[PDB]
Amino acid sequence: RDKLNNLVLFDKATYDKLCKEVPNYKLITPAVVSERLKIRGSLARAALQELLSKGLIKLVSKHRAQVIYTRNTKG
Amino acid sequence: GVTVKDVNQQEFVRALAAFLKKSGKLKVPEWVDTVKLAKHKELAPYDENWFYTRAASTARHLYLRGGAGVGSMTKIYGGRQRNGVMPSHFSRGSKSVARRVLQALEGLKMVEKDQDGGRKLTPQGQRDLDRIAGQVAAAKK
Amino acid sequence: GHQQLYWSHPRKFGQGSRSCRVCSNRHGLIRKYGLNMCRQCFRQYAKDIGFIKLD
Amino acid sequence: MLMPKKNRIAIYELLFKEGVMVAKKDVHMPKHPELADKNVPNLHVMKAMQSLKSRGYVKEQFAWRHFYWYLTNEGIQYLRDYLHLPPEIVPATLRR
Amino acid sequence: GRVRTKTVKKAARVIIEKYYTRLGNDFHTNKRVCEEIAIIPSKKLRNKIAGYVTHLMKRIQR
Amino acid sequence: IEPRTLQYKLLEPVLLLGKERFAGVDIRVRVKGGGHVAQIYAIRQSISKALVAYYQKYVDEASKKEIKDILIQYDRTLLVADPRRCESKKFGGPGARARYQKSYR
Amino acid sequence: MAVQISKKRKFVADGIFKAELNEFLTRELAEDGYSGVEVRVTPTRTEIIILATRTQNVLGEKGRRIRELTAVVQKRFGFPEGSVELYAEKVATRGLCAIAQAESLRYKLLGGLAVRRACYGVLRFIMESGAKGCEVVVSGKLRGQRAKSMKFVDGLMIHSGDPVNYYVDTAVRHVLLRQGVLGIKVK
Amino acid sequence: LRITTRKTPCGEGSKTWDRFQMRIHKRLIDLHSPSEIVKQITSISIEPGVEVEVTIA
RNA sequence: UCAAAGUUUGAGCUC
RNA sequence: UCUUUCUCGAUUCCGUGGGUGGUGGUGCAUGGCCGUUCUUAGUUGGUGGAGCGAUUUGUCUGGUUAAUUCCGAUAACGAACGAGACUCUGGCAUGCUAACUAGUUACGCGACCCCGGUCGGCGUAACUUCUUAGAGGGACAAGUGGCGUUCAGCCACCCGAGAUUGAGCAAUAACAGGUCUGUGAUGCCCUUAGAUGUCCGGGGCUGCACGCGCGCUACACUGACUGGCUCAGCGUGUGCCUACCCUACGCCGGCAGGCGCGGGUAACCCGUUGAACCCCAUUCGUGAUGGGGAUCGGGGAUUGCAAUUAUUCCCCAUGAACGAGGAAUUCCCAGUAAGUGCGGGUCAUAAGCUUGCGUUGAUUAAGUCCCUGCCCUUUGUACACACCGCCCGUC
Ligand SMILES: [Mg+2]
Ligand SMILES: [Mg+2]
Ligand SMILES: [Mg+2]
Ligand SMILES: [Mg+2]
Ligand SMILES: [Mg+2]
Ligand SMILES: [Mg+2]
Ligand SMILES: [Mg+2]
Ligand SMILES: [Mg+2]
Ligand SMILES: [Mg+2]
Ligand SMILES: [Mg+2]
Ligand SMILES: [Mg+2]
Ligand SMILES: [Mg+2]
Ligand SMILES: [Mg+2]
Ligand SMILES: [Zn+2]
């Protein structure tokens, strides 16, 4: 009945949209970004691992089944 | 200082694979590329230099308990042959890959065939265990 | 002659091959430790043999 | 039942030397177990013994898979009459 | 539920009725009385007898 | 300490009594029988017993009562034993309690 | 020893021997008043006690059947010559050995004494001996095609538990009557 | 030693199962003494169920 | 403070 | 079978008497064996009493008890089975008896790490704390409140390492559900040479448009894919005949499986019973998906005398429905239900049958008999092969 047709790669404009907005969510999971922007959870994990590489997000708990990252502590 | 029990094992295998590559004197088998980790396994190991990862684990089991032959390492290293529709059973590892991991570590002086059988960990092996233990300990510290 | 015919079928394995020395039956042969008996004779002879209802 | 005359006389002698006899009821036997020095397949002993029984010479009992025959004095005396032996010698069960 | 059988009860009435003086309220002592005077094969039988014999002795003492 | 998922279960009594009692000791715990979680919930109770036995045994007993009472006032499972053990499957059915499946039709 | 047999295997072979012997003497002293067996497996010698109440009568002509039984035991089971020896011992509580007294009664029933009076007579004889009780079920079809049942019961009787194993003497017996086959359950 | 049989003659009654145990017990005694005296103690005081096997060395 | 609920091989029960 | 001719030496073949053989039919002719009712609390003589008799009272309005368990009321009394009891297991015994096929506590050394720590590397004896298992011993409503003849005891709470450890057995009586398909288990009737016997080889049971029941697998991310890490309990091991033992130690193939020496017939060798789960980082990404693995092409091995109805294992591939269960119905109150593997009988391949073993671990109820069944009392009955009953009229 319902299906998820998610995009494999970000466009450049979407890259600007990520650089702007994604660090503003308090929950940053690859699944969170996947549901909002209709993108795959695995590349989502790689994207959040990328905000880690560029140095944009702090990890709360990553684990083989389920990972969780966030924008670093707000205060 | 530190030992395998002191270490978190996941980054242990990655540090030791790098450590054994740095040594670059295991004499890795020719078929490492072709082989699959068990007739009951579907894909090849996730680590690209996986033969090094199991050489680590098998050696470290011989530290944990020496005298661990091939069949011994396969029993400890056994698991679910998830048979789908049929019921599940215990499944040994693959021989060729296990026997060659043990023969690889017998080659480069990590493991040693003790008198009266079985392997004991050699002076070089216990050295390498506590050095990479300190290295990984420094990483997690 | 008859000596090459009488019993010429091969009896090498299975509950069909061996059989109970009581029944000559091929049903439930206790083969462990060489008891070699059917579930019915076993149930019949368990007390004599020494088996016992502990639990 | 095809005996060799050798068996007829040696089997009667066997019945004499041990007054009593036991045998497994088992048709599918290459060799007899208790008496394995001679081949005398159990089917041979079985069919001879059932022929003796038919003519009154052995007492019958059947257990598990195994006939049990008691030889009577008529059997003792008939065996010594066939083999023409003296009355002095005896089976081991008669001898003391 | 820890309820006394007729073999339990009749034994307790026979014990208190024949030797009311020897018996008393506490189980573990009048147990020593019951095991000495009466040869009870099982310890469970002994102890049950003694515990109903005790509470009954308190009934009469009441 | 693997399993690391069951560590706070291990510290609950340690947090309950505090570091001051346990500070004088160092304790290795040998474990056997049961399974991994059963053994974990075992060594939980074990070391707390060993420390209460240490003060009750080799020094004065007021330490044993104060430790033991703080334990009683927090939680009774620490003292009342879990007798619970795994029930065996029984013949006459496909599962543990069921006796064989009655099958209409 | 050189054959060096295992503990597990040896003991099962013993069990099969035991079962076969009990079956064999039940078959042997039916006519002679069989009353059980006792295979005292002693060192070297294996004493093998026939049980019967009137042992000299069940013994017969000059110890004949006993010498053939000793020889039979040796023949089939493969004892050293004179390593196993039979002894026809007097039965304790001579009424209650059911298969001795109950089977002899089976053959009495087969001889034609009435079933009610005969069982009553034996139960009475053995009661004079001093038995606690019985609950004798004799099934089949009697005086007709229907499966009528006789049931001879008296005294204080218990059924369940382990204590029954060495309290109750039990028997199961077929009998080959002129009219048919009769079941016997002796508790 | 553990065994599980069916009561039924045919297929058709209920499917019933036993849980047969059979325990087998071992004691063992080592002496430091000549052979003839031990033969004297060993000949006397044994009963049917018990099976004694004396290794000489 | 009352809507309803039908049948059951011919192939053998029994002092 | 034919031309043909040789052995042993009356044993036998073939007839006739008469047995005998038959996995013939019939377990609805039989013995014996199961489940369910029924895991509940119930059942039966004797004597006396009440009744022409069939029978009843005993066996109870009530209290009480988990219990037809007990008390007491009382034309009844004393008994019996079953429950309970018993037997075994768990548990309390640092106590008795004790152990180089079990270890122990006192130390020291050695390599290294920063004196010590580690080591199934070595040495110093006694003993039985641990270990193994015989004898004994051990907990009982032991404490209290209400309630109650202040009786039995309940409920609740306290008191405690235990205030039900858990089984086995399991009453009378059924079903005309089943067993002659375990056997020379077996009744009766029938058969036996021109055979309905038997032997040799082969078949159906696996034969397939169709349907069901027990079962197996699912619909995924609380999860799967890929590495690493970790405590067990059930176990076994070379056999009378009987072909296959457990297996340590070094080499060969993805897998089936191949070459050196050892220990063990076993607390000595297998074996520290080298389980999974758990635990860590990746990878997957909500997809009829790596979910699901049915069906089968081609090929390589082993199990077996022989598999076409694939022997099994192996190698590569196609890849049904199924997106969490409608009316229905299986399963459950505590370490239970449910996840998850591990072993055994059988056993050549080795658990697809079947029966166990560990491992993780809830919800709900302390209530009631509405449903479903059950148990008692009363009651009506034209049923009594008993509502799966009997029974009425037209045509
Ligand atoms: Mg593992
Ligand atoms: Mg009938
Ligand atoms: Mg009883
Ligand atoms: Mg109506
Ligand atoms: Mg009809
Ligand atoms: Mg019929
Ligand atoms: Mg009971
Ligand atoms: Mg038959
Ligand atoms: Mg053939
Ligand atoms: Mg998800
Ligand atoms: Mg698939
Ligand atoms: Mg495919
Ligand atoms: Mg009326
Ligand atoms: Zn049988």
Side-chain angles (χ1 to χ4, degrees):
Chain A
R1 44 184 168 177
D2 189 308
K3 304 260 287 188
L4 265 70
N5 57 97
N6 294 331
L7 171 54
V8 55
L9 282 178
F10 276 52
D11 297 2
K12 263 300 282 197
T14 317
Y15 185 62
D16 280 69
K17 189 261 143 192
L18 172 137
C19 296
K20 276 340 278 173
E21 177 55 16
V22 170
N24 201 311
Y25 298 147
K26 291 319 282 181
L27 297 58
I28 299 169
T29 75
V32 166
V33 289
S34 172
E35 182 33 66
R36 215 145 184 173
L37 306 54
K38 274 272 200 158
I39 55 180
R40 296 187 176 281
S42 57
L43 259 180
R45 292 187 270 97
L48 303 166
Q49 264 181 19
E50 283 192 327
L51 296 146
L52 209 51
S53 187
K54 193 171 182 179
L56 291 159
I57 56 174
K58 196 83 172 181
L59 198 177
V60 179
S61 157
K62 74 181 169 188
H63 174 261
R64 43 167 174 182
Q66 192 203 317
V67 173
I68 305 170
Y69 311 106
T70 61
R71 153 158 56 72
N72 210 341
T73 310
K74 199 177 187 76
Chain B
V2 294
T3 67
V4 304
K5 281 204 176 185
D6 197 39
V7 173
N8 174 57
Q9 304 299 330
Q10 172 64 268
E11 93 195 9
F12 184 106
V13 291
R14 308 207 272 268
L16 185 44
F19 174 85
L20 286 160
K21 280 272 291 300
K22 196 145 170 194
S23 70
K25 51 183 188 66
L26 271 160
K27 264 286 281 180
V28 315
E30 74 271 14
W31 41 281
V32 163
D33 297 277
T34 185
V35 81
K36 176 157 80 59
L37 216 61
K39 72 181 205 151
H40 81 260
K41 299 275 96 171
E42 306 301 313
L43 273 54
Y46 182 82
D47 198 327
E48 90 188 85
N49 51 67
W50 64 268
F51 196 91
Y52 295 86
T53 64
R54 199 131 57 77
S57 177
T58 296
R60 188 153 22 92
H61 278 303
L62 292 158
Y63 189 116
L64 294 197
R65 201 204 299 196
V70 171
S72 290
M73 283 292 144
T74 61
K75 204 180 209 171
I76 176 72
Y77 295 132
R80 283 175 62 193
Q81 186 169 44
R82 191 197 213 77
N83 289 345
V85 84
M86 304 178 286
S88 182
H89 293 285
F90 178 86
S91 166
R92 291 160 285 281
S94 161
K95 289 203 204 82
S96 295
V97 296
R99 182 155 36 73
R100 184 52 67 193
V101 145
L102 277 159
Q103 284 178 38
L105 295 169
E106 188 253 335
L108 82 176
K109 299 166 192 175
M110 271 196 172
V111 309
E112 181 189 323
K113 71 205 261 171
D114 188 39
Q115 69 192 342
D116 272 28
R119 284 57 153 73
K120 69 177 175 177
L121 183 133
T122 90
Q124 187 191 129
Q126 202 183 306
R127 302 261 207 163
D128 298 306
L129 265 294
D130 278 25
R131 279 285 261 285
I132 65 158
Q135 293 177 145
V136 300
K140 167 168 285 265
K141 287 165 178 181
Chain C
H2 194 261
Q3 204 82 326
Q4 257 205 320
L5 183 74
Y6 179 59
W7 189 245
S8 193
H9 186 257
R11 313 281 180 165
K12 300 188 186 296
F13 52 82
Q15 73 260 56
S17 62
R18 66 188 66 86
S19 305
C20 167
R21 78 205 286 161
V22 193
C23 294
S24 199
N25 82 343
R26 303 98 173 286
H27 290 95
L29 287 144
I30 318 312
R31 206 144 70 87
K32 196 184 197 189
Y33 315 128
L35 206 69
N36 276 325
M37 60 198 306
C38 57
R39 66 194 182 75
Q40 296 95 332
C41 278
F42 178 77
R43 207 75 180 73
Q44 291 300 297
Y45 294 175
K47 184 57 59 204
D48 170 301
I49 294 157
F51 288 101
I52 58 159
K53 63 199 183 75
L54 292 163
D55 192 62
Chain D
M1 218 62 216
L2 165 71
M3 307 203 193
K5 182 60 171 189
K6 321 177 145 41
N7 283 18
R8 180 159 282 274
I9 294 158
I11 305 315
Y12 278 42
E13 270 166 36
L14 182 69
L15 181 64
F16 196 88
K17 302 295 94 170
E18 281 83 330
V20 88
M21 199 55 214
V22 316
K24 175 159 180 150
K25 187 181 182 188
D26 203 301
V27 176
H28 46 293
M29 308 277 291
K31 311 303 165 190
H32 190 98
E34 320 160 337
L35 191 71
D37 261 12
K38 292 297 302 300
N39 292 37
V40 293
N42 204 298
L43 84 86
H44 194 141
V45 166
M46 274 155 100
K47 302 289 144 281
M49 296 283 113
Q50 294 204 152
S51 305
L52 266 194
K53 183 197 82 69
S54 49
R55 44 172 203 289
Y57 298 128
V58 307
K59 185 154 286 211
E60 186 290 321
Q61 193 70 249
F62 187 72
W64 278 31
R65 278 188 103 171
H66 324 266
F67 289 100
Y68 309 143
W69 287 290
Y70 309 90
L71 186 57
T72 73
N73 290 41
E74 318 103 310
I76 290 281
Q77 301 335 315
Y78 174 70
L79 287 167
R80 78 204 319 167
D81 273 348
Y82 189 92
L83 300 166
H84 311 273
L85 301 166
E88 183 195 352
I89 310 159
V90 279
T93 300
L94 256 65
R95 176 203 99 186
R96 208 81 176 76
Chain E
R2 290 152 34 81
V3 178
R4 277 61 184 263
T5 61
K6 67 194 282 290
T7 46
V8 171
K9 293 217 184 206
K10 187 262 179 187
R13 81 203 265 283
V14 173
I15 283 172
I16 293 173
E17 191 172 23
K18 290 184 168 179
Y19 300 99
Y20 184 81
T21 301
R22 298 168 187 270
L23 295 171
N25 59 48
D26 287 349
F27 169 77
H28 298 255
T29 27
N30 299 135
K31 172 175 76 196
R32 271 78 179 79
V33 171
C34 254
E35 198 156 354
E36 290 274 81
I37 310 319
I39 305 170
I40 299 160
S42 198
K43 294 205 188 158
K44 285 285 174 187
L45 178 49
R46 184 196 72 170
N47 281 326
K48 260 95 167 180
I49 287 156
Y52 194 52
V53 159
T54 42
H55 219 64
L56 288 172
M57 179 68 36
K58 209 66 170 64
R59 286 179 65 186
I60 291 156
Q61 273 180 42
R62 285 178 164 227
Chain F
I1 290 163
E2 59 81 17
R4 294 157 149 284
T5 47
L6 198 53
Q7 267 196 19
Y8 272 85
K9 262 309 189 195
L10 306 192
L11 304 172
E12 263 188 298
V14 174
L15 292 152
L16 287 156
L17 311 158
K19 273 65 157 154
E20 65 297 18
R21 288 82 202 184
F22 291 85
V25 286
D26 80 322
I27 320 176
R28 285 88 180 187
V29 188
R30 63 178 187 290
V31 191
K32 62 191 160 185
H36 291 131
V37 174
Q39 283 187 348
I40 275 169
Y41 272 72
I43 65 166
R44 163 189 192 78
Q45 279 185 128
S46 73
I47 71 179
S48 44
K49 187 86 196 81
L51 192 78
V52 153
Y54 187 91
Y55 270 59
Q56 193 160 221
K57 179 144 74 141
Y58 298 123
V59 311
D60 320 311
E61 193 164 33
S63 285
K64 169 257 179 168
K65 195 214 177 183
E66 63 183 351
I67 288 174
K68 210 184 190 74
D69 203 47
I70 290 161
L71 176 76
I72 293 165
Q73 287 179 127
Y74 183 77
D75 180 23
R76 161 188 187 87
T77 315
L78 274 284
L79 304 173
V80 178
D82 267 324
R84 299 182 298 173
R85 271 150 185 76
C86 302
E87 187 178 310
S88 58
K89 160 164 76 95
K90 332 291 189 323
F91 61 83
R97 310 297 196 81
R99 180 176 182 288
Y100 279 129
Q101 202 194 335
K102 199 167 222 200
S103 57
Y104 304 114
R105 210 178 319 289
Chain G
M1 200 169 187
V3 304
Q4 204 189 343
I5 65 175
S6 187
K7 289 279 176 178
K8 294 184 170 172
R9 277 163 205 285
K10 178 259 172 205
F11 278 105
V12 295
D14 278 333
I16 294 158
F17 164 81
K18 293 328 181 319
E20 183 167 17
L21 185 91
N22 197 17
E23 182 64 47
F24 165 58
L25 266 46
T26 302
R27 295 172 183 289
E28 284 278 78
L29 311 85
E31 195 177 6
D32 303 72
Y34 175 66
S35 203
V37 285
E38 203 272 9
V39 171
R40 178 207 188 84
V41 53
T42 52
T44 311
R45 75 187 155 175
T46 303
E47 310 171 350
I48 166 159
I49 299 164
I50 291 170
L51 287 72
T53 65
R54 301 266 286 280
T55 50
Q56 301 71 44
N57 294 52
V58 304
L59 260 88
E61 290 186 328
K62 284 94 189 175
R64 164 163 201 166
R65 290 158 98 272
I66 282 168
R67 277 191 279 288
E68 293 187 6
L69 287 171
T70 39
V72 150
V73 167
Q74 195 172 265
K75 284 188 180 223
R76 190 260 170 280
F77 298 125
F79 283 99
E81 310 317 299
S83 188
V84 61
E85 273 189 278
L86 263 65
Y87 286 129
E89 208 76 67
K90 65 96 184 180
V91 166
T93 175
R94 71 168 168 146
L96 270 57
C97 187
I99 59 170
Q101 295 297 307
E103 171 274 326
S104 183
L105 182 49
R106 156 184 90 178
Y107 210 80
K108 288 173 190 243
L109 291 159
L110 198 75
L113 182 64
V115 184
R116 297 295 205 80
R117 193 64 171 281
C119 298
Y120 263 56
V122 172
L123 179 141
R124 174 95 57 86
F125 267 122
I126 66 192
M127 187 164 72
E128 259 181 40
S129 85
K132 204 176 273 168
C134 80
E135 188 166 301
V136 180
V137 169
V138 165
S139 184
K141 71 154 67 166
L142 180 91
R143 72 173 212 98
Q145 206 77 244
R146 268 74 165 270
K148 193 166 165 278
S149 179
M150 302 308 200
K151 180 156 178 172
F152 299 107
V153 193
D154 213 339
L156 155 43
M157 156 70 62
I158 61 174
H159 301 88
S160 177
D162 193 49
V164 73
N165 283 321
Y166 65 82
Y167 262 155
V168 86
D169 199 298
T170 315
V172 175
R173 285 285 183 282
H174 307 319
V175 61
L176 293 64
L177 277 58
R178 69 186 200 79
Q179 201 64 24
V181 175
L182 262 62
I184 299 167
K185 301 193 190 194
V186 175
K187 222 175 176 196
Chain H
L1 305 198
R2 206 77 64 77
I3 303 292
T4 45
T5 47
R6 275 279 296 288
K7 285 176 172 179
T8 321
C10 67
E12 280 296 349
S14 189
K15 321 282 167 219
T16 55
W17 296 77
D18 296 300
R19 178 142 175 75
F20 292 162
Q21 288 201 351
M22 179 208 289
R23 292 177 187 171
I24 194 74
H25 308 244
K26 186 164 87 168
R27 313 300 162 74
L28 38 91
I29 319 181
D30 207 34
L31 313 155
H32 301 255
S33 51
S35 59
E36 321 319 307
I37 293 158
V38 298
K39 170 197 301 178
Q40 191 181 109
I41 294 155
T42 53
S43 279
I44 301 200
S45 75
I46 72 153
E47 277 78 4
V50 181
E51 289 69 49
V52 187
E53 292 275 34
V54 183
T55 309
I56 299 159

